[PDB]
Amino acid sequence: MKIEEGKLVIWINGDKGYNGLAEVGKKFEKDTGIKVTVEHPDKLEEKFPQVAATGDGPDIIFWAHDRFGGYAQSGLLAEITPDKAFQDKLYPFTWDAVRYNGKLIAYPIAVEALSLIYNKDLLPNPPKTWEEIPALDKELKAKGKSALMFNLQEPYFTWPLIAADGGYAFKYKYDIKDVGVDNAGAKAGLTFLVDLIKNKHMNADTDYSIAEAAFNKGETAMTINGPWAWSNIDTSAVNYGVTVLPTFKGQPSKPFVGVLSAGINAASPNKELAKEFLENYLLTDEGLEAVNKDKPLGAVALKSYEEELAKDPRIAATMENAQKGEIMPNIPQMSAFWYAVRTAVINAASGRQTVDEALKDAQTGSELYRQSLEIISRYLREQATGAADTAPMGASGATSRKALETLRRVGDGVQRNHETAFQGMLRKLDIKNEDDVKSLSRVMIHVFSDGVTNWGRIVTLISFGAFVAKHLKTINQESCIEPLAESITDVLVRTKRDWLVKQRGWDGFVEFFHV
Ligand SMILES: CCc1sc2ncnc(O[C@H](Cc3ccccc3)C(=O)O)c2c1-c1ccc(O)c(Cl)c1C
Numbered sequence: 032m033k034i035e036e037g038k039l040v041i042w043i044n045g046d047k048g049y050n051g052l053a054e055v056g057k058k059f060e061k062d063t064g065i066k067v068t069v070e071h072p073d074k075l076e077e078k079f080p081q082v083a084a085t086g087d088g089p090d091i092i093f094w095a096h097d098r099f100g101g102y103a104q105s106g107l108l109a110e111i112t113p114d115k116a117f118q119d120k121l122y123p124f125t126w127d128a129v130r131y132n133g134k135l136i137a138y139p140i141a142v143e144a145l146s147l148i149y150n151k152d153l154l155p156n157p158p159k160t161w162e163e164i165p166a167l168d169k170e171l172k173a174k175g176k177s178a179l180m181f182n183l184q185e186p187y188f189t190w191p192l193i194a195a196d197g198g199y200a201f202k203y204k205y206d207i208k209d210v211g212v213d214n215a216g217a218k219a220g221l222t223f224l225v226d227l228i229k230n231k232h233m234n235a236d237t238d239y240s241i242a243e244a245a246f247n248k249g250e251t252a253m254t255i256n257g258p259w260a261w262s263n264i265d266t267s268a269v270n271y272g273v274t275v276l277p278t279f280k281g282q283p284s285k286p287f288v289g290v291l292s293a294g295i296n297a298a299s300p301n302k303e304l305a306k307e308f309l310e311n312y313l314l315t316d317e318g319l320e321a322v323n324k325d326k327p328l329g330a331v332a333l334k335s336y337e338e339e340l341a342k343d344p345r346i347a348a349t350m351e352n353a354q355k356g357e358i359m360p361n362i363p364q365m366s367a368f369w370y371a372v373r374t375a376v377i378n379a380a381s382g383r384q385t386v387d388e389a390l391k392d393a394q395t396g397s398e399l400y401r402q403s404l405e406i407i408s409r410y411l412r413e414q415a416t417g418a419a420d421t422a423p424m425g426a427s428g429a430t431s432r433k434a435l436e437t438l439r440r441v442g443d444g445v446q447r448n449h450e451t452a453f454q455g456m457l458r459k460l461d462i463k464n465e466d467d468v469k470s471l472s473r474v475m476i477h478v479f480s481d482g483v484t485n486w487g488r489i490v491t492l493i494s495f496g497a498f499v500a501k502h503l504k505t506i507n508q509e510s511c512i513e514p515l516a517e518s519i520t521d522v523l524v525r526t527k528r529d530w531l532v533k534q535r536g537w538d539g540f541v542e543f544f545h546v
């Protein structure tokens with residue numbers, strides 16, 4: 032077991048109030064003798080799943096609720112079991128964001144939404160519409176100033192515009208069959224952003240650091256940022272307001288709402304100290320004030336302390352923008368949707384891809400997991416039982432049908448030609464229950480990993496998976512077919528993601544074996 036016992040390590044993002052969090056760790060250490068280390072590593076949302084998976088990493092991880100469903104799906108988080116007394120101290124909707132398969136997987140800390148931030152000295156009336164920002168930039172450019180600068184490297188900041196005229200991630204429970212990443216509304220919003228860049232009103236290269244510096248030295252009239260950014264603006268002496276985001280096509284910008292949440296590592300031998308630090312030290316008037324004094328949290332989940340901060344108009348603007356937005360879903364494929372949209376916005380902005388090209392590729396990566404499982408689960412199940420699934424694939428399922436048709440035709444030959452080799456490998460792997468199926472996964476990455484990438488090898492993997500599903504059903508282990516399909520899908524899309532999207536995904540597969 033790698034994680035040290037008798038002490039707490041905390042991971043929190045570098046835009047957050049980590050010095051304030053460390054003051055609450057000092058107060059925990061002063062009362063219990065347990066040293067709390069707070070770190071803010073780069074890409075901790077990428078690195079937590081990698082190190083947690085091997086029993087390593089921090090005791091507590093802080094991030095918006097959107098990444099927590101994937102970590103729970105991978106068994107990287109402890110179940111949070113606060114009593115009714117502690118649960119009543121926080122807003123029920125904040126608890127809704129940290130509930131996954133009916134289990135609390137984290138402690139909610141604060142509701143974050145993007146607002147529009149403007150220089151009252153340059154722009155006494157901020158724009159009501161996105162459409163008027165070009166004329167405003169022209170006007171401010173004559174004065175050696177610019178209208179707007181925000182981070183174009185993170186899809187988070189651009190999403191409100193993309194979602195305004197009907198863009199969305201998963202239709203709402205959440206329908207992961209229904210992805211709205213390349214709909215007319217999404218094209219309209221992202222096209223308007225590329226047009227601002229084309230007409231020199233914004234810069235494709237602008238990241239968080241550049242946008243913050245330009246706003247805080249009064250070079251740009253406007254930025255798009257969250258509560259965490261107010262501290263640095265306070266220091267900079269800029270007379271700023273926090274207001275409702277400008278509308279697009281007469282409709283509000285819908286910011287993706289995040290709930291800063293604290294998760295407990297499953298591998299942690301200090302889960303009792305972590306529960307005690309989070310419930311009785313951090314989630315208190317004194318604890319949330321210590322963190323908020325460093326960098327504002329936004330609208331905190333703690334009712335007592337949220338009553339006080341509600342009077343602040345910048346919080347009111349945050350909640351107004353939050354109402355017009357959507358609570359982010361916490362489902363496992365959020366990570367793949369964010370990765371896909373990040374790439375789409377960066378490519379459309381730089382002109383490497385068109386808005387049509389970029390958003391189509393992001394709609395493929397957003398659907399790739401569910402689309403792959405649908406094909407593999409149906410193939411494995413129909414091979415095991417001898418009867419096809421009657422149910423319809425759905426509205427976007429023309430690809431799944433042709434891909435299953437191609438897999439049937441192409442992959443039945445592979446089962447026949449490799450029968451002897453498959454039987455040899457299935458005998459040598461002693462499969463017999465869900466436990467034995469857990470083993471297999473480890474094998475398949477090792478095998479599917481260090482080899483040349485082609486549709487031929489993808490077919491062999493799925494074909495051997497069907498062969499194992501046939502065996503599973505034969506020994507009354509038919510319930511293990513759905514998890515084996517999940518594991519084959521997991522190996523394939525987690526390791527070949529970038530290749531599968533370059534091949535137009537399953538359309539590429541049908542195209543490749545067409546005759
Ligand atoms: C967990 C087992 C998997 S998963 C997977 N995914 C893609 N390809 C595989 O094997 C082929 C090579 C090959 C040559 C002749 C017969 C079968 C396959 C390859 O790597 O190209 C495999 C194998 C695998 C590897 C070695 C073997 O001897 C057997 Cl029987 C198998 C089933």
Ligand SMILES: OC[C@H]1O[C@H](O[C@H]2[C@H](O)[C@@H](O)[C@@H](O)O[C@@H]2CO)[C@H](O)[C@@H](O)[C@@H]1O
Pocket residue numbers: 044046076095097098143185186187188257289369
């Ligand atoms: O940009 C995609 C990104 O969006 C959100 O991350 C936000 C985070 O929620 C905020 O707390 C803030 O600090 O900035 C981040 C933007 O870089 C999602 O939470 C995150 O999962 C996703 O990758």
